[PDB]
A paper describes a structure:
Since argyrin B clearly bound to the P. aeruginosa EF-G protein encoded by fusA1, we sought to derive more detailed information regarding the target binding pocket and possible mode of inhibition. The structure of P. aeruginosa EF-G1 in complex with argyrin B was therefore determined to 2.9 Å. The overall domain structure of EF-G1 seen here was similar to that of previously reported bacterial EF-G protein structures. The detailed structural data elaborates a potential new mode of protein synthesis inhibition whereby EF-G (in complex with argyrin B) may be blocked from interacting with the ribosome. This may stand in contrast to the characterized inhibitor of EF-G, fusidic acid, which binds at the GDP/GTP binding pocket and interferes with the post translocation release of EF-G bound on the ribosome. Supporting this mode of inhibition, argyrin B bound purified P. aeruginosa EF-G tightly, whereas fusidic acid binds EF-G in complex with the ribosome. Hence, argyrin B may constitute a new tool for the study of EF-G and ribosome function.
Author numbering:
A (entry chain B): 1 to 8
B (entry chain A): 3 to 40, 65 to 195, 198 to 301, 303 to 407, 412 to 528, 530 to 543, 545 to 705
The structure:
Amino acid sequence: XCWWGXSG
Amino acid sequence: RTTPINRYRNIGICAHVDAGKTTTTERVLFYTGVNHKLSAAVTTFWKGSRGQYDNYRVNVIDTPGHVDFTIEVERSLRVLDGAVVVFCGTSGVEPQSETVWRQANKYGVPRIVYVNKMDRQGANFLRVVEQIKKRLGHTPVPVQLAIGAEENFVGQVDLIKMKAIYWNDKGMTYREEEIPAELKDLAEEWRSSMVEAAAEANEELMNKYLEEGELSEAEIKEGLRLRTLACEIVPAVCGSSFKNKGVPLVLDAVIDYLPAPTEIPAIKGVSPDETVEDERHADDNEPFSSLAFKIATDPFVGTLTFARVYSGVLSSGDSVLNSVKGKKERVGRMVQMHANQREEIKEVRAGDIAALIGMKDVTTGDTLCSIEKPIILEPEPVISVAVEPKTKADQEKMGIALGKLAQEDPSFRVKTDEESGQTIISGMGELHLDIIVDRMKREFGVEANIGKPQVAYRETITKDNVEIEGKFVRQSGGRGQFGHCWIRFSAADVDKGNITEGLVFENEVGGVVPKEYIPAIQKGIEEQMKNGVVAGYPLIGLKATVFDGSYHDVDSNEMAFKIAASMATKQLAQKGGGKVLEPIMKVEVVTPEDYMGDVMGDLNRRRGLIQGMEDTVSGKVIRAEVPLGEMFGYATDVRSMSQGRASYSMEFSKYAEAPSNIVEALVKKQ
């Protein structure tokens, strides 16, 4: 949850 | 032909924030327009500030005024041959200007510097020169010094001629006066630096400098021009575009230090029929090749298409190839935008800029090349936000638009995190995204409210083999609700550091719980698991095994059993060792040596932990395990410390326990 990669 | 290639100057006025690009362009056209008499690309002529040179064709190119348009700015750097990089005497080396200079190094663009606004408060030329030296890493070479501080701004001291230049109205006519005594002592110091910087061009010049302790003005422009092209130095000049004092001398430095299309490396393209790289030298005899940089449109005239020619000649009536697509277009009427007139052309040679009036499918960044011999000439996001429509109903049509906008704009990215019910739209600037959302609000209809991405926290248990009783008894709406089960919960499987995702469910019931109610227990646990036991965040995974529980044949149903299982799973808030987790990233920082101290200690200002360190060309490569939460605004904070020199990569690495200052505030949130 936090960047372009979704991841987190 | 017409004008020889060596007499051409394809330049770009690179200026960003407090630079005054708009004034400097209007001025360039003004001075050139007048001097000669005696839009996307502006074809002008320059004979010299004092008519000292031959007539040159200076092709003023429009460079973007915002670093968020990375593709537009990277392309403009290929359309120009040399750069006129404008700074403000005050502001100086800003983060905005640092980025364009770094991509310029990537294409190896010979530059000169213009330190405009010497009239404005707090403006000092040499301070900016140290900033160019100390923060931009090239080798700036002042060819002028400044006369008067702020309001005191009269002119420049031409360090080659050694005569102070004052100005006469509208600042086109200049006075070749003398260096005032206060400046005489300083002009020496800076002249010696320039003569020396010129001396180290070729061995010839060093032996001539070593003979006397000097070189001729012509041998100075020789040395400075060689190293300008070699991309080893940036000749600096100052002025005030608005207050007219200095713009002709800048145009001269363009003539003196900037290259012609031949004095730069041949544009490297790809074989249309891409695993092979061919190239085109700025030659008329080389097969035709060019790129389209601005598709403008005039109401009366039609659709303009700004085209920089790299190799060969193109004439009105020609039939070419749009190598990108595959489609063959026929070249119609052609023009060349002048200062005010629209001058109608017939043919356009290598290293020149002409506009293709009315064309079929010709997109921006399109290669227009020789049909016979063809070639095709033509990034990580910085900022990411959480998006959602103003009214929950819209949701499907938001993703339709965003999905289309990401397909229209390759510099724009869209991704959804389902566990957190978040859509993450990303790109190059706050600006870039403010514009994209705005375009979705209008041209697409979906009004959306944007926020800072929320951290997708997860949950886990520690205590293994915990036997919890879930007892559901509700007497409502003319019925009874009975649910009774005991489930034994063990912690989610771990690697090393990686936690096993999902629910591992088993049936250990002797027959006290019926066959048909068992899946409803799984559903209850699963439902609770995603509803969260501690601070209301989904559990990573769980080992759950039901083994006991009574029932009342009439009041017992699947939903009562779903509830009692959730009732049991909730109790892991106390009986389970409820550990909140946080995303941990596998970060990699490529920093130059100086900045390594700042960067490395900033990773610790982020709870990050060092997992290795290599040694590279300019500096360090640091691999680190850093929480995503602490990663907020990295692309920027890092472009800040490294002075726009560093680069970073990241990817999700694992999940690990979160700190009590975070955790406790997340439970108080419940």
